[PDB]
Amino acid sequence: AKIDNAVLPEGSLVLVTGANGFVASHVVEQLLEHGYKVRGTARSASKLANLQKRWDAKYPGRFETAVVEDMLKQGAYDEVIKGAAGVAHIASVVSFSNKYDEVVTPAIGGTLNALRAAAATPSVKRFVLTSSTVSALIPKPNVEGIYLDEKSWNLESIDKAKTLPESDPQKSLWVYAASKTEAELAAWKFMDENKPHFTLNAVLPNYTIGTIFDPETQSGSTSGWMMSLFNGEVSPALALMPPQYYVSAVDIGLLHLGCLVLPQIERRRVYGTAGTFDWNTVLATFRKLYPSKTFPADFPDQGQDLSKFDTAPSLEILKSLGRPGWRSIEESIKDLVGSETA
């Protein structure tokens, strides 16, 4: 169809774990938009109710809600994975407690549980793991000489996550980074050791900006935090996030799609890093979109992100899907907050 030489046949079924998540929901949307059928999991059917309603209207009978209360439970995917040709593991365990083993173990556990299910299911030919740029690094403002490629790993997060005192403002951020790093490392290790009959690719988004399909339940996401600033809320947790790269939710969805169906994309770590930003460039965009609205004044200078990412596979995917280039930050933020128009 739209995609020539697609590895997964038209209308193929794709299992998307944690489909009620912000990023996940865009992955689902892009799949449905491209004619693929989707079975999305959530810890409860109710958690997917609003989105199910949305997708039933836009793509009648293309999305199916599947319940998986414990993504760590042995045999958790035995039923929902049946007949799936592709799998997008986007589900993540809910735990923000600074206990290392308590956070890292489940992260690795959930990832391997999904991979083992896929390995045990012959119909699965493609698997895309939703990782994060934190598996490569935690942003370092004004620091020169940082180039991240597919061989870049956040090895420092492992030590820091367990040595830094609880008083370090970024403690929880390092634990999270360690969890994503170890989890992705475990995924590639599984592929090398077991050599399953499917191809693995990982998408590493930085700060995803886009339309929040279900504000009621997706406001804790990156875009949710940005929306809070739009609404005038300034929180310390916000001033914790340093300058880094944004990526359109639309593009992240396209990146996952590419990893699932493009033949020339195999064993890649696809960076979702469109361009740099800081809270002031965000506020500037808000003011431009809504000139009549009152917004918080600029934050103190937070420096800027001088790091660079090897986005080759990312650009390759976007072009192959007929949507070359990264959607701009203005258009991405417009997707999130809209604009003063009528």
Strand proportion, as a percent range, falls in 5-15%
Just give the CATH class: Alpha Beta
Shape: globular
The appropriate CATH architecture is: 3-Layer(aba) Sandwich
PDB class: oxidoreductase
Keywords: Rosmann fold, oxidoreductase
Assembly: monomeric
Entry title: X-ray Structure of NADPH-dependent Carbonyl Reductase from Sporobolomyces salmonicolor
Describe the structure.
By secondary structure, this protein is α/β, with parallel strands linked by helices. The protein starts with 12 loop residues before the first strand and ends in a 5-residue tail after the last helix. It has a single domain (12-338), classed as Rossmann fold (3-Layer(aba) Sandwich), CATH 3.40.50. Helix 1 crosses helix 8, helix 3 runs parallel beside helix 5 and helix 8 crosses helix 10. The strands form three sheets. It has a seven-stranded parallel sheet, with helices on both faces. The chain has helices at residues 22-33, 49-58, 100-120, 155-163, 171-194, 215-218, 222-230, 249-261, 279-289, 312-320, 329-337, and strands spanning 13-17, 37-42, 63-67, 86-89, 126-130, 147-148, 199-205, 207-209, 244-248, 269-272, 275-277, 308-309. It has eleven helices and twelve strands. Helices cover 38% and strands 15% of the residues. Helix 2 (49-58) links the parallel strand 2 (37-42) and strand 3. The PDB classes it as oxidoreductase. The entry lists the keywords Rosmann fold, oxidoreductase. The assembly is monomeric.
